[PDB]
Design a protein around this ligand. Structure first.
Ligand SMILES: CC(=O)SCCNC(=O)CCNC(=O)[C@H](O)C(C)(C)COP(=O)(O)OP(=O)(O)OC[C@H]1O[C@@H](n2cnc3c(N)ncnc32)[C@H](O)[C@@H]1OP(=O)(O)O
Ligand SMILES: CC(=O)SCCNC(=O)CCNC(=O)[C@H](O)C(C)(C)COP(=O)(O)OP(=O)(O)OC[C@H]1O[C@@H](n2cnc3c(N)ncnc32)[C@H](O)[C@@H]1OP(=O)(O)O
Ligand SMILES: CC(=O)SCCNC(=O)CCNC(=O)[C@H](O)C(C)(C)COP(=O)(O)OP(=O)(O)OC[C@H]1O[C@@H](n2cnc3c(N)ncnc32)[C@H](O)[C@@H]1OP(=O)(O)O
Ligand SMILES: CC(=O)SCCNC(=O)CCNC(=O)[C@H](O)C(C)(C)COP(=O)(O)OP(=O)(O)OC[C@H]1O[C@@H](n2cnc3c(N)ncnc32)[C@H](O)[C@@H]1OP(=O)(O)O
Lengths: 388, 389, 388, 386
């Protein structure tokens, strides 16, 4: 009755866009936004009623390695065909196809947080929203900003793509040409054009809010939609530019890392308030063995992790993880966990102790948890400054 | 201007009114019930007491579980008629030197303003979070065993809850002396809404219903959890599971809680748990840096040499070789340079070396020096106190 | 000093539109949206300074009969000519002209509730606005939905007009071609296009709200502007479709009947909240005898209602009303009421007991009020769902 | 394991109160009728309960039927989802039947609890906000019989005025109810004004008194308006509209069809600020309830009632203005007892419940004939909570 196959014609590609938009209901150019050969379709009695797509991408794992990543998106089923196992059919077929392509991880941005964990996706990174009261944000230590250059209207999508390409922070994802084309359209839809300030090692985009009432007796606020900084000097210089921007009362940064050292840049840490925290990267480990081997660890003793994976039985095994070697093992495990929770830990956005506390990790010794956290610990919280 | 310790009870009573004046907006009990007799410092100009700073004999749990001698600093304040004259600096300098002589190695406080104490070496070492849970959306991801849960609402005593709290082992946890419990006896008496107290063999939870006059209103029946003590993973799930299953409750507000509280991982809908706010908590001041670094545990990494800057306590201004095996003073060239305030921020695991280096508070001489230091100091849980003073 | 005549030129029709817009102050080709030979103009010293218009329409009265109805609208006088009796002159001529056309009722939508009762208009229907918390709205009984069809971009204004034409609910009014052309203009101006879902016996139009901030932690809301259901099965199927939309958090229905059985469709009636109730149909009985005879009654004993009418003395008489016959009588009345309050009861939107409680009905015999409610009682609250 | 019995000592009744308060969680901190409180005991400890009061309820036609005012229902959170409430409700309803009472009603804390037991939403209440400056009377309103009785009001005197209540949906206010409201009035520092009429009274309290003499909207709140006559109703409301310092008058709870908008020249001065379910009605004896109410001079209709908890009501009833008896004739209408309760007081019609899928018709005119019989002129309303 229901057939799941890859889309193959421009007519099928265009219909999948209409189907995906319909399922999203409230989402605000034709097929120059897609990558040919990765769009799955769900057909009942002939008509296309759902689908799931992905893009060839990479993902930066702890240690800087850039792993093959499938950026899953465009998932949706028409309301006339929901609750029939169609998404499950799409996701199972998609992950198997992602595996055959040599890709090691897949990630998405969930429209609802109750959908994808049953398929092995785990919340691996989170994002924060900061509101800075600029009048209270004098820098604790001097900030240079000498290399700052204004590029407001002269900025191009090709120039910002060149700066972003050298992104090295953990959790960062590829921004293909199709992603920049999509944001060319978003920029055209907003009448307020964004300011672009650059540094030799980064840039920052910001837009004024309620401009019709700028001179009012309220908080003139700007909104930063992208902050790319490949060096500590660039991070401080770019942030320092905002703290020194005249006429600005409130600076809103979002999405930003949950451990962004904004409170440590100012004499008054309370000038920086966290206005919200949200789940970001839903990571699905497609090849668990290859994923664990692509990431780096600390000089600890090896720990054996038994992973449970129902959709991909190839990952259901025991792995000895160490800074020296990652191998399949038959030794008794130190930790047993499902692939979804392993994905939550994989990028460093969660620890083994906290997932065990929630009841998602089974330990054989109280110090097995400590040993595993000693290996997997990272210095920065992972963060994907990009949505798709 | 004379800075001396208070001695007579009249001076202790006057220092409380002086502290209340400095706080301006703080909400009848003898001062001796809430004070430690030999620990209150006073600031005198002419005969008049115009400021002071106090502390309590306490402990603090550092990474590794060790319970370190800790000075719970509080009651700090100067009258507005004597501010900007160096009086607080004289109080803090005398207080920190006295804390050192008592053999206590750390001091912590709760700052009324975030712009006061970093100049004295205090660093934000822990933070607290506020969660709002939409109970209808918070069905447990895995089944939660609540059979050991017992209702103890009116039968709870300050002495009985103190016995459960004493077994606190989480990093950042601080002592709750009898004076702390006496103070919260008064806060409970002032509030007409009495709190529910639900217990588990390894913990307890206190919660209070909000706007009771409009309880049956359209919607948004909220409860407020002011204390969640759980010494076990099973106790943690049972106590939270008790909250998620409470009938008639629409919104559950937890605060203050650890910033890494695994509430989003307990429920099928992580977005049923929303972070409503994050605030600085522990302002930590390392009084004996060497003894503090030696009391905590580290991972099996290579040693790192940290050069510490300390202006108030030059005894700490030195170079320390930090490793899981030994912590000693060294003359070797350092791998990392930091002031004592930022070292305090990292000490409990609430900050990493990379993020402080990014803010310009850490100077590295090798690229991997930061990575090596974070490998040693990293911890699995964010530090958290859950108690104020 | 003041001349009242019908407009006859397109230049006059265009100015009457400018006068009406000026009188409305804050309201957002005109001959395409107008019906000629029905627009009255008020001329002072030659210049057009006010007017009153109407459309040839019908109105569904209790029992299903479709009576000749004058859809009055476009009433307005310039602020430089108010409080001079011009509206009273406009309304008197209009109602007399409506009477000569053989039309028996007139209705309008009042901009202010203090204007039209002095002319015999009474509030005959009211409308409600519902907000449904979708997560709490599981159906009490299973609702089928196989006959539901998505028709979003394939919908035509002509097709929905064909579905609306079968309207049989009490209070429903004609939607002339001019009305649909007017709503073509509203739909073209809004960049957000509406979803159109159909059933063999009805349809429903809905629009997503704040689409720019759809994925944020704020309740994703849709707004239903039209719900047409000619059968209980169509009503349940269409509403059931809304309750099953996967990404929707809040459903707003409005305007809807004040007795819409939404709370009885769900296990949690409090998932449906009434966000407001407002007067809708201002009904004016032009031919009281013909109106009373066109509607149906219950098998009760006749009651004699004495109607007071100052503008139209043809209605100032006593009428013996029963399920069998409606006649003029000289017998002593059982009930005395002005035509304005009779209009309020005429569609079933009010009862005789409550209007007597308000002091608008006088009873001359014991039990006359009780008897009158038995005849005039209806099972459904009247409702138009259409504005003009 | 779990034992369900009636309480027998005041010590048990008092703990049942604390257990009820515990289950209610956030309810604010003698008041009982002995011999009507059911308790749930596991190993000698009381962990749940359900209580009721001897009361009456005004059904269409004015008849005052024996009514069980259900309240105090609650189970400790350590013993929920084990069938204890179902055991309490089953025992309670069978006990209500044995006492000769024909209806039971309650005020539900959650709307998702009691329908499975046959309770139906029979009345709803509304909250009105009147912009007093815009509320001039449409017709002149007399008020010479209005008398200020503010501090001279007594619980015993006001209870005598309420006793003459004849509107459909009204319930008895026992002495225990007035004692409970004596306690609420003593706790509130703002004492209520009490204005009387020969046929009614009205209680009102000023809102936010601390900022009265200079703010945006000085509002008063009317918590009780009892009026046994059209003249008393207009006089009492007219008194409120003529209070010189009041900007906004808030009435609640009031009937959903309160003719306030028809009293003023500006109907939009009266806004509906909210609508909430009120009476959850459970027909304990369907036949006797159908007989106690009045109907119009229509043709008989046969109603088939479904009732799982009380099979005595599972039958077919011929309803007419002359006679209500059990019959074996094929029914014209089929309904479960919960939905029949929704219509019983006139707060719902057969057409709207059928449209919601709660009524099945066997004849085309059966729905229309049933509405002809059951129609009432006033929406039912219980100006009282318990
Ligand atoms: C990467 C992105 O683009 S995120 C965008 C996701 N898309 C949307 O939100 C569009 C709107 N929604 C939809 O299109 C659909 O509801 C989908 C795709 C989310 C789900 O499609 P379905 O065909 O209904 O899924 P399926 O039948 O396989 O359900 C599998 C299980 O997940 C559950 N489930 C699926 N979707 C949801 C949901 N939205 N909320 C809660 N539970 C869900 C089902 O109950 C079922 O559980 P069960 O096995 O215990 O019965
Ligand atoms: C643990 C606790 O209880 S926290 C409670 C702290 N108490 C209060 O906040 C009460 C209100 N404030 C006060 O009483 C006083 O302002 C105090 C105690 C904070 C400071 O007392 P002072 O006598 O003015 O301090 P002192 O003169 O030594 O100032 C030292 C430096 O800190 C600065 N400083 C002190 N307080 C503040 C403040 N509230 N805001 C900003 N800067 C301050 C001074 O400007 C000075 O800086 P400088 O050396 O560059 O000139
Ligand atoms: C169907 C629709 O389109 S409704 C749209 C109605 N139009 C508007 O609201 C536009 C703005 N207003 C206007 O154009 C004018 O004020 C109108 C049309 C409301 C009234 O026109 P006028 O020529 O001033 O009316 P007119 O002089 O005949 O007044 C008759 C009586 O009604 C009263 N009246 C008229 N309008 C109002 C009002 N808005 N508020 C209160 N009373 C009014 C007058 O006071 C007068 O009472 P009186 O005899 O006791 O002195
Ligand atoms: C008249 C008055 O006083 S109203 C006051 C009502 N009391 C309260 O609201 C206090 C808070 N709630 C409680 O104490 C309890 O939840 C009670 C009393 C409502 C229910 O007690 P329980 O022992 O859990 O009821 P019980 O186990 O018999 O449940 C019977 C059914 O109703 C359902 N149910 C019972 N209470 C609820 C509720 N609050 N929400 C949703 N469903 C419920 C159960 O799921 C069960 O359904 P099922 O047969 O499909 O599995």
């Amino acid at each position: 009755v229901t057939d799941i196959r890859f889309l193959q014609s421009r007519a099928e590609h265009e219909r999948a866009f209409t189907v995906f938009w319909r399922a999203m209901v409230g989402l605000p150019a034709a097929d120059e936004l897609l990558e040919l050969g990765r769009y799955l379709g769900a057909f009942v009695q002939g008509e296309l009623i759902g689908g799931a797509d992905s893009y060839t991408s990479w993902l930066t794992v702890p240690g800087g390695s850039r792993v093959p990543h499938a950026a899953v998106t465009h998932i949706g089923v028409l309301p006339t065909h929901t609750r029939r196992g169609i998404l499950t059919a799409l996701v199972t077929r998609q992950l198997t196809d992602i595996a055959g392509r040599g890709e090691i991880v897949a990630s998405l941005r969930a429209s609802e947080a109750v959908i994808y964990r049953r398929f092995g996706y785990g919340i691996a990174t989170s994002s924060a929203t900061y509101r800075i009261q600029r009048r209270r944000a004098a820098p604790l230590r001097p900030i240079d900003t000498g290399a700052i250059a204004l590029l407001d209207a002269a900025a191009s999508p090709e120039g910002l793509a060149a700066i972003y390409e050298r992104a090295a922070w953990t959790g960062s994802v590829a921004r293909p040409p199709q992603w920049w084309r999509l944001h060319e359209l978003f920029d055209a839809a907003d009448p307020v054009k964004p300011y672009v300030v650059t540094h030799p090692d980064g840039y920052v985009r910001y837009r004024p809010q309620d401009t019709a009432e700028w001179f009012s007796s309220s908080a003139r606020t700007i909104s930063v939609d992208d902050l790319v900084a490949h060096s500590d000097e660039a991070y401080r210089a770019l942030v320092g530019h905002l703290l020194d921007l005249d006429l600005v009362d409130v600076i809103e940064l979002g999405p930003r890392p949950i451990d962004d050292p904004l409170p440590h840049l100012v004499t008054d840490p309370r000038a920086v308030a966290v206005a919200g925290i949200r789940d970001e990267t839903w990571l699905r480990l497609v090849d668990v063995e290859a994923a664990l081997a692509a990431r780096t660890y600390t000089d600890g003793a090896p720990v054996v992790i038994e992973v449970q994976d129902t959709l991909l039985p190839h990952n259901a095994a025991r792995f000895s993880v160490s800074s020296d070697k990652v191998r399949r093992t038959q030794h008794t495990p130190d930790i047993s966990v499902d692939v979804a929770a392993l994905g939550s830990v994989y990028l460093g956005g969660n620890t083994w102790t906290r997932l065990e506390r929630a009841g998602l990790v089974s330990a054989q010794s109280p110090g097995a948890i400590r040993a595993a956290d000693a290996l997997f610990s990272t210095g920065t919280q992972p963060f994907a400054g990009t949505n798709f």
